[PDB]
Design a protein around this ligand. Sequence first.
Ligand SMILES: Cc1cc(S(=O)(=O)Nc2ccc(Cl)c3c(Cl)c[nH]c23)oc1C(=O)N(C)C
Lengths: 52, 322, 760
Amino acid sequence: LKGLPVYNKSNFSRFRPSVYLPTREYPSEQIIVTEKTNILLRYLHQQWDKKN
Amino acid sequence: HVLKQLERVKISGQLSPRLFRKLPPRVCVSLKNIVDEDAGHIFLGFSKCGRYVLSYTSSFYIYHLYWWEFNVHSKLKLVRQVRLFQDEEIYSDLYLTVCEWPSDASKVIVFGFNTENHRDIYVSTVAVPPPDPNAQCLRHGFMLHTKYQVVYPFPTFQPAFQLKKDQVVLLNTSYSLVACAVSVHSFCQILVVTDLRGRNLRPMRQYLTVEQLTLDFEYVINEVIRHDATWGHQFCSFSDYDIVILEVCPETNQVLINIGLLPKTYHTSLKVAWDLNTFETVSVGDLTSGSVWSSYRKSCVDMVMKWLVPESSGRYVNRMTN
Amino acid sequence: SYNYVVTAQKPTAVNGCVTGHFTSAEDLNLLIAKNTRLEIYVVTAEGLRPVKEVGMYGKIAVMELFRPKGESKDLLFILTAKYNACILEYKQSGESIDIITRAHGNVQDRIGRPSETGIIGIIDPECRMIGLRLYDGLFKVIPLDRDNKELKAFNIRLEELHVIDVKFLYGCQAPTICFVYQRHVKTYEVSLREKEFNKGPWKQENVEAEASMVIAVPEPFGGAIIIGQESITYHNGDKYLAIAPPIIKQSTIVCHNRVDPNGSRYLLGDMEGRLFMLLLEKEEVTLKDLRVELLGETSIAECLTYLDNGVVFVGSRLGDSQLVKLNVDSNEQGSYVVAMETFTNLGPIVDMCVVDLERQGQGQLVTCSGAFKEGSLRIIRNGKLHIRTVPLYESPRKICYQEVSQCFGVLSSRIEVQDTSGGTTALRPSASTQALSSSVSSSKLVEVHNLLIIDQHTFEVLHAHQFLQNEYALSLVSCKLGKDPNTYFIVGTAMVYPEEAEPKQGRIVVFQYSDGKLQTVAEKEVKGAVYSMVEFNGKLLASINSTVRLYEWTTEKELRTECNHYMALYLKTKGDFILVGDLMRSVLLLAYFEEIARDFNPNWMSAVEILDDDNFLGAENAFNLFVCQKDSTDEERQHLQEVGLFHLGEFVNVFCHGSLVGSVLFGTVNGMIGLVTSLSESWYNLLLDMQNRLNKVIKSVGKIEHSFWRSFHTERKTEPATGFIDGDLIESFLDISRPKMQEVVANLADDLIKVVEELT
Ligand SMILES: Cc1cc(S(=O)(=O)Nc2ccc(Cl)c3c(Cl)c[nH]c23)oc1C(=O)N(C)C
């Protein structure tokens, strides 16, 4: 028991962060968009597709 | 039990009415003789904001509505007074029913229903007092009395859906369903006899515009039977229909309405979607007298229950019927 | 009303903690989450060398570091309590450090009711999709494709409508979820293309009612472990395992961490502070039996995070966060855990009374903090902000200062467990039993409530006063009532009984510290509980339930009531005016009683404060700040118009008048300490234009609009922020470079520098 794992033995052997204010702008790769169609609407239309 | 709950709030920092709902209402007043003419004034229920106690006169009849201020322990103070259905002669007792929009709290809508084949239904919207008059805020106070009737297969009241959309009220007459939008101030419901009043006088229709959108049921059913029914090529005749609103989405302005249409007519249940934005798309068809109506309505309520999505508390449509 | 809010002390409570490789694949990282505060720490040989603390414009409620295939390092997904989700990618190109926001968007649906249990965010172990519990009976799902410019999140109806918590299972060929609904456990597989809840891997099963946590066991073990009181159950189809060790019964398990990558070793944290090592026996690749092992106790844990070299970061919210080291050997007291470094945290600020103990007008803030075993008084003075901590090992309610005897009276509560051996023994030897002198009320007139008088120099408990059994001490204040010049310790208790939900009996007890001995000068029994008290021109103003009665101190050494009024909780007094903050009736005014004006708009205020004679402020339960004025109109004057609105983002518990260096100090459960200061109209206009232009030139991490972040938000209505200046934004202005100052000033340097300098 206590055979704990170690990612790297060096860490924790010799024993507050600056605020990051962004000035430059890097364009966003992707945008989250939420589907607005109501859940009944989507389900009934999908079943309509199946029998069509 | 309450004290340790407040202690939990002090530490957790999370306090919601839902977990303060188990506690009984601390204040409970008899309201005996406190309300004027304790008879002359029948209160329905507490308003959504709670600062008002709606009450109407028992009484042709006048049905004077009177809003009352609500204090923790004091006499209630009448703050508003209107006769609701003014341009409406009355010869029956109506079970008054008033509701408010989920978030458009500026005005409330009251529906009076009574006990043959035709039933009298009266609807009117009144602006709640904003918290010569020479006060523009009071000038907002408006009145929109409206009156119609329905055939023996009386449509389901379904008050919440009928008002799910803000600024708009859906009325399902026996032969059409109307989407009245009493907007006071660019345009909505685009991409019925509604006499208006206010301050006991009738102005021309700060300005308020009622955007009315209707579908004639018979026409849309003819369209659907012509274009979207596999057994519609052999359809002979339809006599009567019941329209039930399954659900109203205000985000996309769609209302899902069901029709239980009836060499003989056979029971069906045909689904319809109406885009209030602008335009009728058939969602789902169906397949093959009061009893079948009741069974159909039972099916609709089963569907609504089976797809119930609890609206966020505060975005509900309070129904107020004593 | 034109007010300026700035944060004197950044919040220190640990909301969340995730271990991964954000900065660089090779460097292990432990991201710490604090309300609107993201701290990145790289674990090194010396310790956790801090990297960067970027400030989110939202309450970080969901934080997961995930690695999509093809990304060199793990990307970061943050979802603020204002329902803003974002994807962050660390980029230390050369010296420049930039957190590029790969994805940004709101996910609020404004349809379903916020879930009763906290918001819940899962990520598919194969990084296919993101699962997000937002409202009852709904399940927001986000695809993780890289190609599409717009990710199309959608919802699927969860049928249970009351789900405790969900987790994504491991090894399933399709993304299957496993949760517990109010209780049973059910699993529905999820189809991304079809957008529906297909049948899950295994059938639903019944579980103990207290089951409140699912842990996704990784492969090769597979399955999921449901955690509940006397209910340690493992679910994996045919492999249904269960265990009920008596050690679990002591308290509900609240935290879980994967010590072993294979999942053999898992860490458990409970409210009592105990730390249980959960073991999965490795049979040939199946599980034979579950077992748990207690390793000792630690500070109350909000989130555990195992680090390399067998060390763990006990993220805390009710107290002080610790770096506990797990020793393979047992300690002499049978504690496999040894503390090494303890990160300071003000935690829940239940109360605070600014006092200038020294001279030189340097107000020193003494604050009751922590709870349960970690309750402690905090002393913070400007430098930077040196913080001296005096542990009490019991929950403190509120503190009042009596400069006459140079003492600090604090209302303390300690938890004791009933037994048939004697009356009841205490859990731990706290300060209540460690006081120099001890006495009890024992006046005719489980939790043990005591009054601990403490010195203002040595900070050592001088005397304790354990109240009656079931006597719930609620309120305390010190003042010289009436003509009698001896300062008294007037406190309010509640005779709460388990049978009765709402209290019916309570006693206003007058006390006086006689050279080391607390004397009960008077004990007036009051119908109902005494929720809050305050002095009023030499007369005590009590608050019995909804009633608000003033009391007079007669020469006969007794309390006599004056008048009544008609659940009052918050009493602040200025001049003749009494501000009453009810729980649902919001703000009310009084005078000497006659009602003056009430804010009718319902708000669950957490604290109130009278800035000026006409500027009344309070904070509701929506972590938002509003100031209402009294317009001076025969009856419209009885209406309070909310002049200014603001979304602070923290649950302020108390409002104290003063300043460390008008000024109002406020304390939050997260441990934030902030300054509310009034402004002049011209200066307010200049600052608002300042902030508007600064927003344009300063970028926002996660592309979160500052106007939206600070805009008023509650369950009913949302309005833009008015009458309030963010302050912190303006502080950022001085930090930016002079060329960017040239841009922000635009059409209209040193004068703005000076104004922000004095604002500092
Ligand atoms: C979930 C819910 C919503 C509403 S509603 O306010 O829109 N009313 C309402 C809706 C639909 C129908 Cl078909 C009817 C009929 Cl028939 C009478 N009222 C109706 O009521 C419920 C509800 O609890 N039940 C129906 C049982």
